[PDB]
């Protein structure tokens, strides 16, 4: 009975910026998903297709754990069929998503006096992201007809902006750590059942 390494994902010391969101593949273990639901640690625990009640009763081929950091007001964007700077340019969930979205306030860890500007988010993109697409480009965004040549100025902007969490930011502007559990099901044998 190898137990799924959920402690690696939820209790990691550093979380990734949303534009460079971290994915952790989970396989060949048994996950007691209930232990997470019954925690009172999480401000958000919403499941789609699956039901969060009564779900360590299933077997999946592979489980993906996507972790990143966003502000409180943007957690509503991590859901099927949403739009906005996070859903369009940083992390996009498919319309037919089946999984669970879990978030909790991390202002005690991800805020610092003078501001914590290590957490970034993508600002510009000519096209919306596809589901589960990950864009790590930092090339200067060309907002006009003049090419930018990797130098910023008018109509040539850096695509990433920093959040800047501080301990007395409003709860909407406070950092939240998010973990998206995606359950894939195939022809292939299931490797993670979690009785």
């Amino acid at each position, epitope marked *: 009975t190898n137990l799924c390494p959920f402690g690696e994902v939820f209790n990691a010391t550093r979380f990734a910026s949303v534009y460079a969101w971290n994915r952790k593949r989970i396989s060949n273990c048994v996950a007691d998903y209930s232990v997470l639901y019954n925690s009172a640690s999480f401000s958000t625990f919403k499941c789609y297709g699956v039901s969060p009640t009564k779900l360590n009763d299933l077997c999946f081929t592979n489980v993906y754990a996507d972790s990143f950091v966003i502000r409180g007001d943007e957690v509503r964007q991590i859901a099927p069929g949403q739009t906005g700077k996070i859903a369009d340019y940083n992390y996009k969930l498919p319309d037919d998503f089946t999984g669970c979205v879990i978030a909790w306030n991390s202002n005690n860890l991800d805020s610092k006096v003078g501001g914590n500007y290590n957490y970034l988010y993508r600002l*510009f993109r000519k096209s919306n992201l596809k589901p589960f697409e990950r864009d790590i480009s930092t090339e200067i965004y*060309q907002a*006009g007809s003049t090419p930018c040549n990797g130098v910023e100025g008018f109509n040539c902007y850096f695509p990433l902006q920093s959040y800047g969490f501080q301990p007395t930011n409003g709860v909407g502007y406070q950092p939240y750590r998010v973990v998206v559990l995606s359950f894939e099901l195939l022809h292939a044998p299931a490797t993670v059942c979690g009785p």
Partner: antibody, heavy 119, light 110 residues
Framework: EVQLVESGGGLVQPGGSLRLSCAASGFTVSSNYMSWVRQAPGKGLEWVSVIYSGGSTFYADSVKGRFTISRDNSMNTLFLQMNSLRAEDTAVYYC?????????????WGQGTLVTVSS | DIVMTQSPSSLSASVGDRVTITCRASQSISRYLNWYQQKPGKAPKLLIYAASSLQSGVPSRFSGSGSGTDFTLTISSLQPEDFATYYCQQSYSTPPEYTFGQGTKLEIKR
């Protein structure tokens, strides 16, 4: 330079429809955040709608379901399709270029066109 | 929602005076605030963004300050051309709200 020139404003009866146009020069409409902001006679500014670079659109609660923001890549022009217009919609309508750093701020505005909704 | 209240709404000052306009938000908006200057019968021109940063091409006498719920627009020494209606705008909400103030009408006193 940057220039935004607006058109389409005029007189419409209650319940009618009218489509504004904003021809832009100095940037690519299909690459920037664009917003419309209206000013009723004598009153303050009121944001009505915004379109992102990726294409997602957002509206004020006063104009949702009735107004629609659009744009054309080939002629570099933003549009606002206003339907079910009311007397309160009477305002001067501006098109502006949005820069998405540090929240949003509008660094270039058009000169504006007048829309009058009266019987 | 969020409501931006300006103070004062009407204000008069002589050429050379220092001018100060106040904005306040119903919630903390840490520094996602801009200032616009709109002269009669013309389009609004942006003055300050990010609550402190002067827009390119604006005189140095326009200054921005404040963060949280209270912000301040300042004109070091008023110029005859500076009579206008100044608005503060919030860009802190997700999804957008783009809340404005009611405006502060500034007249030149002589």
């Amino acid at each position: 330079e940057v220039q935004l020139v607006e058109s389409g404003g005029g007189l419409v009866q209650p319940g009618g429809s009218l489509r504004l146009s904003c021809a832009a020069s100095g940037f690519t409409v299909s690459s920037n955040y664009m917003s419309w902001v209206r000013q009723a006679p004598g009153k303050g500014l009121e944001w009505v709608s915004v379109i992102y670079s990726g294409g997602s659109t957002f509206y004020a609660d006063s104009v949702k379901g009735r107004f629609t923001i659009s744009r054309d890549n080939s002629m570099n022009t933003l549009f606002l399709q206003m339907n079910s217009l009311r007397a309160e919609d009477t305002a001067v309508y501006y098109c502006a270029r949005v820069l998405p750093m540090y929240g949003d701020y509008l660094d270039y505005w058009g000169q504006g066109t007048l829309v009058t909704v009266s019987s | 929602d969020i409501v931006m209240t300006q103070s004062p709404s009407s204000l008069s000052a002589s050429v050379g005076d220092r001018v100060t306009i106040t904005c306040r938000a119903s919630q903390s908006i840490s520094r996602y605030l801009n200032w616009y200057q709109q002269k009669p019968g013309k389009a609004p021109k942006l003055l300050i963004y990010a609550a402190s940063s002067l827009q390119s091409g604006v005189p140095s006498r326009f200054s921005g300050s404040g963060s949280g719920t209270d912000f301040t627009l300042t004109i070091s020494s008023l110029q005859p051309e500076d009579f206008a209606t100044y608005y503060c705008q919030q860009s802190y909400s997700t999804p957008p709200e783009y809340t404005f103030g009611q405006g502060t009408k500034l007249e030149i006193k002589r």
